[PDB]
Amino acid sequence: IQDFARSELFDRTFEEGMQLVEETAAYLDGAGRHDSKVLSRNAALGYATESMRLTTRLMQVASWLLVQRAVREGEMPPEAACAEAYAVEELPFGLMNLLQRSERLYERVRHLDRRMYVES
Amino acid sequence: ARSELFDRTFEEGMQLVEETAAYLDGAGRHDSKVLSRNAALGYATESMRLTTRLMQVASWLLVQRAVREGEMPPEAACAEAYRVEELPFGLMNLLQRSERLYERVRHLDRRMYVESPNE
């Protein structure tokens, strides 16, 4: 019943989660700023709302990975986490990439979340 | 984000999560089973209010924690993580401890990320 028996994979998807967050904050406060301020207004409004979706999505993943790590270290009980979460767009190259990486990271976590807690 | 002495609120958060998980899974079941159908429904609905509030704080505490340990960048924490009566004795205590922990962290969250030009 216990299992969670975390390693190898988790351990891999944790590294993906943390690197994505580091590259996002570096982009949004760096190149993304200059990428967005040379857009048209409709493209910038699109950049604005899609930046929010990116950071929110990563917040869920970061929160998930850190809690599951806290459970793996024994800081949090294995039983706590059993309720715990789970239009025209021509955007810049950098934002578009991080958004596609975050989507692949999200469902990678969601599938891991279901096999880890929803099963069977 | 010097956020030391938030160790106290960190230790408080992690203990309450631990006590909640011990209660809802131990003595809380007996408090639920020997209870009227409507109050048992109040037990279930408020325990979910409790556990979702604690994951909110637990997730905040750690993400702070990772920021403090340099696992996550400080630039992160932005727009990121912010915020019938008859009930068993054990549940009431955890709810009221969570209400105090939440206001403790919400005050802490505001002084770390929205204060500066206030008030």
From TrEMBL, chain A:
Complete-protein stretch covered: 17 to 147 of 169
Organism of derivation: Caulobacter vibrioides (strain ATCC 19089 / CIP 103742 / CB 15)
Superkingdom, taxonomy of origin: Bacteria
Name of protein: Regulator of CtrA degradation
